[PDB]
Amino acid sequence: VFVLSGYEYFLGFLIICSLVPVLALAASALLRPGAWIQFNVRYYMFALVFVIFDVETVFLYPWAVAFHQLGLLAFIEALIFIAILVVALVYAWRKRALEW
Amino acid sequence: ATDFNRGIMKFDGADSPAMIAISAVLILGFIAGLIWWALHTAY
Amino acid sequence: NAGTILPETILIVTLLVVLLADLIQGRQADRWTPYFAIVGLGGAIATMIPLWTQPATISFFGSFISDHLSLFFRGLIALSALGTILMSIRYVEQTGSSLGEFMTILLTATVGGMFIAGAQELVFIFVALETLSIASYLLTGYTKRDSRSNEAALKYLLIGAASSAIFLYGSSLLYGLSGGHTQLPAIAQALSSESLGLVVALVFVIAGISFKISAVPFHQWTPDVYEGAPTPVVAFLSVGSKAAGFALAIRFLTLAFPSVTDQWQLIFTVLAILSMILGNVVALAQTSMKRMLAYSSIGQAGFVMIGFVVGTEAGYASMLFYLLVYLFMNLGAFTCVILFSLRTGTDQISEYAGLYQKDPLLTLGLSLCLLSLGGIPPLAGFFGKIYLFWAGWQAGAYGLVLLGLLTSVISIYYYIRVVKMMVVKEPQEMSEAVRNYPEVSWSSFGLRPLQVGLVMTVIATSLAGILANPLFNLVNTAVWDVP
Amino acid sequence: MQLTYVLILAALLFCIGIYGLVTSRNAVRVLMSIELLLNAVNLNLIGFANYLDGQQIKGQVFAVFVITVAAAEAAVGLAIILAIYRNRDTVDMEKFNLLKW
Amino acid sequence: ATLTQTITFFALAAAVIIAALGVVLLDNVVYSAFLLGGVFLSIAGLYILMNADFVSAAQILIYVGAVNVLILFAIMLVNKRETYTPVPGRWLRQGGAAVVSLGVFALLTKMILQTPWQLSSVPPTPDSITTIGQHFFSDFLLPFELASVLLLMALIGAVVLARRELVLEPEPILGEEVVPPLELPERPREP
Amino acid sequence: EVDYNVVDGVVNLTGFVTMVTGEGLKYLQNGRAQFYALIVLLAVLGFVIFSVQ
Secondary structure (H helix, E strand, O other), X not given: OOOOOOOHHHHHHHHHHHHHHHHHHHHOOOOXXXXXXXXXXXXXXXXXXXXXXXXXXXXXXXXXXXOXXXXXXXXXXXXXXXXXXXXXXHHHHHOOOOOO | OOOOOOOOOOOOOOOOHHHXXXXXXXXXXXXXXXXXXXXXXXX | OOOOOHHHHHHHHHHHHHHHHHHHOOOOHHHOHHHHHHHHHHHHHXXXXXXXXXXXXXXXXXXXXXXXXHHHHHHHHHHHHHHHHHHHHHHHHHOOOOHHHHHHHHHHHHHHHHOOOOEOEHHHHHHHHHHHHHHHHHHHOOOOOOOOHHHHHHHHHHHHHHHHHHHHHHHHHHHHHOOOOOEHHHHHOOOOOOOHHHHHHHHHHOOOHHHHOXXXXXXXXXXXXXXXXXXHHHHHHOOOHHHHHHXXXXXXXXXXXXXXXXXXXXXXXXXXXXHHHHHHOOOOOOOEHHHHHHHHHHHHHHHHHHHHHHOOOOHHHHHHHHHHHHHHHHHHHHHHHHHHHHHOOOOEOOOOOOOOOOOHHHHHHHHHHHHHHHOOOOOHHHHHHHHHHHHHHHOOOHHHHHHHHHXXXXXXXXXXXXXXXXXXXXXXXXXXOOOOOOOOOOOOOOHHHXXXXXXXXXXXXXXXXXXXXXXXXXXXXXXXXXX | OOHHHHHHHHHHHHXXXXXXXXXXXXXXXXXXXXXXXXXXXXXXXXXXXXXXXOOOOOHHHHHHHHHHHHHHHHHHHHHHHHHHHHHOOOOOOOOOOOOOO | OOHHHHHHXXXXXXXXXXXXXXXXXXXXXXXXXXXXXXXXXXXXXHHHHXXXXXXXXXXXXXXXXXXXXXXXXXXXXXXXXXXXOOOOOOOOOOOHHHHHHHHHHHHHHHHHHHOOOOOOOOOOOOOOXXXXXXXXXXXXXXXXXXXXXXXXXXXXXXXXXXXXXXXXXXXXXXXXXXXXXXXXXXXXXXX | OOHHHHHOOOHHHHOOOOHHHHOOOOOOOOOOHHHHHXXXXXXXXXXXXXXXX
8 A cells, every 4th residue: 555645756757857867968978079185174073063963953844844733842842852952053163163 | 749859758759640640549549449338338 | 741750850951061061161160060960960869769759650651660670770870970970080181181071971871871771662762772872982982092992982883883773673673573562561462472573573682782781792892892991981881881781671671571581581591601601711811900890790790690580579689789789899999990090000900019008098999899799798799699699599590500609709719819919919019109109199189089989889888788688678679560 | 565575675784784794894884884784774664664553653753763873873983983093094994903802 | 556666666675785785895985885875865765665755855864965974074084095905814704794694684584474464454644744743742752852962962972082182282281190191091001 | 749739630720721711712802893793693693593492
């Protein structure tokens, strides 16, 4: 059984937009004729605070959809989740994690 | 057996490892021979 | 219904105050932020005593129980961090790392461990096991420039993140062997047929349950982490992260599998007869002091599993009384490992020799905590082992207590080896501290918490067997709420 | 597509990450094989939630929290890789065996 | 109608295990990390067929967009131009790991097939974004608040384990005996 | 000499086959944490055959 409605066109549109580069690069294929990066830990540290906050935002998407269907108790509980991770943002500023 | 062979009446001359095992089977056999005597001769 | 998690949410608040003070004050807060976490741990201990009289409710929609068993193990993990903070007030303050940043990761492992003891959902077991495990990889590699703590943070990661995936595949199977039902009381009502699917779900979860308690086919991280990690973290994972794996195993293997019970009582005997042998014979061939206590924690784990496999009301009371006095033996021995590692470098055996005339409070603390770890009278670890063999003899198990006694004499020989090189060596036989001991002060930063964590632990090691009768009644009330 | 073909796919993905856990010599490929294990227990879980008790999806909530922990197990895990690399200038799992016995 | 949901399953079920063989068996480590997203995107395509449209988009946001980017940032930081090619280092211990991996698979395929699964014939996913947010605050509420403390700790610890020691690297603060900065006081020695 | 060597040899052999036992399982750990993950995964395969019958 598959009770999701709207995904009948998602399979073909996944194939058609995949057929946009693989055929245009083929339609072009018939018409055409001291090496160091310095180890600076800022690419990893900027991605480190991304993973902590991409998990933050994905926990807020079910709360934001069902927000007026939960009540005031589930709003204080969702506020403890944010206010703990607000200190996570304050920790990233003061410890010069995202200074670049 | 070098410290057992001090300069007094000891060091008889039979301190070889061939004599250690043949003195063991007579001494430990007499205790076991008296133990097996004991469970039958007493009552 | 959020009044049952009050011992954990007081530790949540003081986790944030010692974090913001590192950001606000900036290493000037390290003079007071350990002592705020002590009364934060003490205020979390003192609120478990009003919760002891409550009639064991199941709060948070059936996902958290507040029984006496969950409150006993919550106090053991809170006392494990209370003893660790009294140690690491000088230890990681001498490495130059931040003191407030250490005790934040140390308190997340505490509240992560304290939530394991009362969890009843498959998800809250895994979430609280994660934040205990994720916090402990950061603590074994907290010094970050050693090539020994970095090597110990790696081996604990690639086994810890591995064994928590074996634990998840058995936890996900418990969601699928039942028709949903992530809660452990709802699991037992659905599955009782003892099929092969329940067997693989049982083996997969005790690859991670018996990974925190370090049984021998899953113990391989323990002797390599415990010599690379900072010694207070070594002191924490031996009574805090080890009792939390024992807090899980009573709450998991008796609630999720009361039908299948002769199988995990057969596996954990193999986990006991292997960790009593390999915990105590390989600790003979150890030279490092933190490595001798590493195989000790594997060996003392097999004594706790003696009461776990018998499955009686005195058997589960024997493993909770032994884990209670185990905190007074590790945290008193590891205090003297730290207090010897702070005066002189290179804390290993055959460098403690020639002592007892220069540091007599260290040798009286280290001997009476290592002799009690061997289980000699009239110390606390003697009575703790007596109750394990009394409950072991009570229901079968005549070969476990014989192996528990024969490996307790092999346990004596390497513990008395440290007491040999503390008090019986002449003053012409010391290698370190040969007129090199720093003439102890108890006036520098953090040495007075290090001393009171030694005095109040050996007192709790010498007198906890003579005065065991209040502790025997405090433990036996935490067993009636165990199926 | 039945329930059985999802769990075999999750069990096969488990043993590929199991093989990558023991045979990989770079320390980052071991962490990439850990993510194969933590997606094996998620592919096992949503299939357990789509076919068993799909009205109140308790597996998809539990499948969310595994994604969050593995996000935090890799961020902690790669800070361990960068901590060894600053001291021991390689990433080679046959070179970290100095705490042997 | 029904076969178009099945032929897109095995096209994705083969896309994950080929990419999972690419992250394990390939000699290049950067090729493993780009194929690691091929594992994660194919599993995210498998969740849409399994009526998990939220967790499908929650995998592309984290496993593809956050974890795989974090992996790739932490592989372009470790190249060193040194593989050293020591394939037979100690022995043929890569054959003992092929025994257990085929053994666990032979275990679980025996377990998956013979187990009677009690699958329910009820209609699933009644707008499954509200029933997952009602679950974050009724049943799975205490896991939800502990995930913030887990993430906050994972931001505290992974910063202090990966930040550059540029504040005071030659810092002998005190001493009873000599201890190096940012290192454990138990100094290594041979017995 | 049957005291010092024979019945004292048994006592100094209980303490000798235990010291060389701990120096044989000391080599069970050898670093290389892939091998530590091997024993974890082999004992999973052991306990699922040992406990089904």
